[PDB]
Symmetry: C2
Subunit: 83 residues, 2 copies
């Protein structure tokens, strides 16, 4: 395996688990709005659940930039404080 895959695997299960998200539509490249059909309030929920997974309180300016699984994976995998 790999650390990036470790992160991607947990992000995938977090996003799939969201009640509004069709888990069968989720890919490592899925964009929350354009692919998964979420609205702005939904994205806040998913990102917070991602923050829960890695115990990582993300500053608002960085957290608003996370709109897709690649965005989330790229930010978490480079953050040495992800748990």
């Amino acid at each position: 395996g790999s650390h990036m895959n470790d992160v991607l695997t947990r992000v995938l299960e977090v996003v799939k688990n969201f009640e509004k998200v069709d888990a069968s539509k989720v890919t490592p490249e899925s964009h929350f709005v354009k692919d998964l059909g979420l609205n702005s309030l939904d994205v806040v929920e998913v990102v917070f659940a991602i923050e829960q997974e890695f115990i990582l309180d993300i500053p608002d300016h960085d957290a608003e930039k996370i709109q897709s699984i690649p965005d989330a994976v790229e930010y978490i995998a480079q953050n040495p404080m992800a748990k």
Copy 2:
């Protein structure tokens, strides 16, 4: 999940893949010699395969403590250079 579980998952599959190792005997608590029936030279091979998994040079002095799956998970999950 967790970083420790991410490590444990990769260590488990590395050890199971060892031809000398009966995968059905492998648990998160398995001791390489006493539980999996390996000898001292086998343990050297297993540690190297762990070094491969996390792209991590473990010094010989640190390798002396890695005799079991709990030992390996603890050492790797606390080494911030594990990949």
